[PDB]
């Protein structure tokens, strides 16, 4: 792995997307809800690991969080949902009388697991929930339960799968809700939102979100380097024996390689 040639590709791919987006579209039409900067932004580029062995020969269906030095989803329009494994009113009161001001803004809807299976069992409702928020969290006490509850509409794609969040102490609902101290909760929510996410599938290609196309490239280069070093040492088996090509590519362009 070498950092400079990673940077000069990161210049080239990012500069391409401005040329692609700013180019007009030939049927004589414009877009009301798509500014030139808004589509230069909000277009994520992501790192596509290519392996030799099929990593984790099963469907893991639970994301792993790689702590990024500078966070991913900390924009101004992010709606986030916290699926909690205990009385909804305790967390509703927790996020109202606490959870600073930024976290109070991003908390869109906190929903109990029991209220989720009653109100969102149908496939209208789990499609309306998919399109309404942007990142979904989950308590670790209900991470296994969400495949049945939020089914294919939440788990066919890896863009929005519920992020595992630990919210326990170290049961009658109204009497007791085993949770962390409240400042330890809101601090941990901050980590989960802005973390690059790995998704283990019986596959050779793994797409990891690294950032959007409006950041400055050295910011991105420091971010991709931390994604590279964390993923090999922690997640893919046969750490550098099973490693193979590492491409970076945007949602509408070709793949820019790095090899290992």
């Amino acid at each position: 792995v070498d950092p400079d040639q990673t940077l000069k590709a990161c210049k080239a791919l990012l500069a391409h997307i401005k040329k692609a987006a700013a180019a007009p579209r030939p049927d004589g039409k414009q877009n009301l809800l798509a500014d030139e900067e808004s589509t230069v932004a909000e277009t994520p580029i992501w790192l596509t690991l290519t392996t030799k062995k099929h990593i984790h020969d099963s469907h893991r269906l639970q994301p792993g969080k790689i702590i990024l030095p500078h966070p991913l989803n900390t924009s101004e329009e992010i709606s986030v949902c916290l699926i909690t494994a205990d009385p909804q009113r305790f967390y509703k009161n927790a996020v109202a009388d606490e959870f600073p001001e930024d976290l109070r803004a991003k908390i869109g809807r906190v929903i109990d697991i029991s209220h989720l299976k009653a109100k969102f069992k149908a496939y209208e409702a789990q499609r309306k929930l998919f399109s309404e928020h942007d990142v979904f969290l989950a308590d670790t006490r209900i991470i296994n339960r969400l495949p049945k509850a939020l089914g294919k509409t939440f788990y066919k794609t890896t863009t929005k799968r519920p992020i595992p969040v630990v919210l326990m102490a170290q049961r009658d609902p109204l009497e007791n809700a085993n949770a962390r101290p409240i400042p330890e909760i809101v601090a941990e929510i901050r980590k989960a939102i802005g973390a690059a996410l790995v998704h283990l599938s019986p596959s050779t290609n793994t797409a990891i979100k690294v950032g959007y196309a409006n950041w400055e490239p050295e910011k991105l280069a420091a971010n991709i380097e931390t994604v590279i070093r964390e993923l090999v040492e922690r997640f893919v088996p046969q750490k550098w024996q099973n490693v193979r090509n590492f491409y970076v590519k945007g949602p509408e362009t070709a793949a820019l390689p790095i090899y290992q």
Partner: protein, 274 residues
Amino acid sequence: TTKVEDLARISLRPGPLYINVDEEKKYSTVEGLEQGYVVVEADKRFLLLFSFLKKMAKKKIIVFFSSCNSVKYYSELLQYIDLPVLDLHGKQKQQKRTNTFFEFCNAKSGTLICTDVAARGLDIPQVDWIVQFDPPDDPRDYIHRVGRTARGNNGKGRSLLFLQPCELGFLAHLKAAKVPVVEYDFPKNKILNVQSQLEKLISTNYYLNQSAKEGYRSYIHAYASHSLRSVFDVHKLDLVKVAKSFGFSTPPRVDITLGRRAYGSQPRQGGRYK
């Protein structure tokens, strides 16, 4: 016009007093204009307005409605829906009217709701958009005067008009006067579906229900009394869908309308028939 003085000879006394404070320098531009339009279904007109205003925040926005009652209802709804928007309607103080516009003319960003008859009496400042949500009162004055004021001297100001699918004869009338058009695409994903939140508010809040009912009726009633009935026809309006935009699941009742002579008969000649 010719009919005007015949109204004067029948109404006025033989000696009138003639006053002309008219603006004879009518700068009705014929070519230096470009009109925008968005074809939007009747049941997602508001959702496109809300998605427009939310994403085109940090800019200058002026919206034209057709009735002061719909301005009043949209003002109270947007405060509940949490979008800070300025307003200009007739149920306000005259002093509050002026301090609202002076605040808007000096502001950097912002968004103002007023009726189209309010802007005709008002001095439009430099703005980034002029959006005609409801149909205009007189289409000739909209295209010429409001198109040029949207262009707004130097700064790039663009004007758009909301059109239903049953309203595309406006394009034929625009083509007759030979004025350029551009239509915007607006993908269906970026619509903020707050329809469920809206209908929960209308069905539960009583003050918003009154404002919704009066805004819906005034919108239909202004539509009926429109001058150019070829394109703005109320009988080509699906009233269930237009009450969906206002926040109703059942459209409230409104009166949309508001050969052989007698055998052996002769014309009347006498009698005090009252």
